Amino acid sequence: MSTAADLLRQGAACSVLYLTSVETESLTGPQAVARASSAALSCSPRPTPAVVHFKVSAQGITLTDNQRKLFFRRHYPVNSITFSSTDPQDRRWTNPDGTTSKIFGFVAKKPGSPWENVCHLFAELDPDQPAGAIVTFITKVLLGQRK
């Protein structure tokens, strides 16, 4: 993941599976994705998911409203991001079609509220950029967690 510069030096704008957003201000890194994922299953705030745009950059992460059907716009820069994970305990999302995909979540502070952070839950998509790798290098290059 040290040679992950290839992704940040480029700034890939890929497509991801949008699920839902959950508050994780009191949670930690992985636990954030946990409450976010579990709540999305137990409570199910969102019924049918959709494929939206996602941009990975070392200056911050950005969400993109490709179709603007549910609710998308942008994400949070490095000054707001606190953590990123591909899954809490290696859980997957079951699409209405029956196929299962990983569920990753990003922990970032919302503008105006630096004391709190929210974890936006998004399922994996775009086989060119592995979800279990994208957030992994992101955490390392964004926060400087790189070994």
């Binding site: 940040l8 480029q10 700034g11 890939a12 941009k55 070392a58 086989p127 950029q129 290059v141």
Partner: peptide, 14 residues
């Protein structure tokens, strides 16, 4: 999908 993109930032690294 298949091709890896890279058009948005200014080539950063932490």
């Amino acid at each position: 999908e298949d091709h890896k993109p890279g058009t948005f930032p200014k080539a950063l690294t932490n």
